[PDB]
């Protein structure tokens, strides 16, 4: 029926999210300006956007109940592996099926397939990413479920390099049970039909998107002219 602890967890995550995801997107003005013509014209802007987003995901992760109990090394492994996935997940909030784009408050900060494809990454990444956004949007998750999914994504014991996988697993299960119980007690059918299973599938979809993003990143890292336009944080998190 959702223990006091589980309600506690959900409250913590909702707050953590509100403190790390600003729906006014007021900080986007600090990013190097977007350029829509477009040979890699969107790379500078989106590089800053992603770098900024990485910082926000780290802020969120640190507030996840139990994350603080992990070692510095394990925290780093988890963030490095989940960053792009959580970024793709949190972005579902600005994504709109009306015109298949991420509407971040204004024309200049509204990104579609043509914009997102001007940063060195191909449709081999973008097409599946857009499909993912649609599938996730169609789940019509409660914000409670959205934040739980992001936290579950971050605290994954099977990430390469994890040391105390047992501690990680325990922390994740606590989150996974909170999710399974919230769906049962707070998400009325039919919208709840196999919802947990579908949410877990999205975690699988994100692994695939992550793998493809990594593949293309490596390729691009072989070209200094592009790597030159990224940020130090991106270079560090994604590989240098």
């Amino acid at each position: 029926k959702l223990s006091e602890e589980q309600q506690h967890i959900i409250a913590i995550l909702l707050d953590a999210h509100h403190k790390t995801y600003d729906p006014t997107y007021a900080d986007f003005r600090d990013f190097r300006p977007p350029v829509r013509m477009s040979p890699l014209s969107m790379l500078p802007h989106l590089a800053d956007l992603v770098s900024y987003s990485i910082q926000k995901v780290i802020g969120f992760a640190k507030m996840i109940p139990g994350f603080r109990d992990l070692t510095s090394d394990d925290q780093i492994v988890l963030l490095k592996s989940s960053a792009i996935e959580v970024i793709m997940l949190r972005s579902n909030q600005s994504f709109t099926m009306d015109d298949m784009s991420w509407d971040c408050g204004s024309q200049d900060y509204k990104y579609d397939v043509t914009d997102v494809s001007k940063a060195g990454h191909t449709l081999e990444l973008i097409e599946p990413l857009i499909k993912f956004q649609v599938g996730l949007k169609k789940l019509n998750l409660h914000e409670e479920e959205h934040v739980l999914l992001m936290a579950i994504c971050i605290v994954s014991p099977d990430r390469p390099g994890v040391q105390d996988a047992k501690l990680v697993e325990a922390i994740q299960d606590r989150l996974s049970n909170t999710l399974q119980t919230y769906i049962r007690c707070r998400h009325p059918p039919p919208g709840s039909h196999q919802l947990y299973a579908k949410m877990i599938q999205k975690l699988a979809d994100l692994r695939s998107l992550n793998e493809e993003h990594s593949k293309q990143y490596r390729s691009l890292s072989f070209q200094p002219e592009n790597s030159m336009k990224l940020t130090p944080l991106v270079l560090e998190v994604f590989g240098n």
Binding site: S72, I76, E236, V237
Partner: peptide, 11 residues
Amino acid sequence: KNHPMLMNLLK
């Protein structure tokens, strides 16, 4: 693999 900025943001 020594992640200075990440480590700093986590602490």
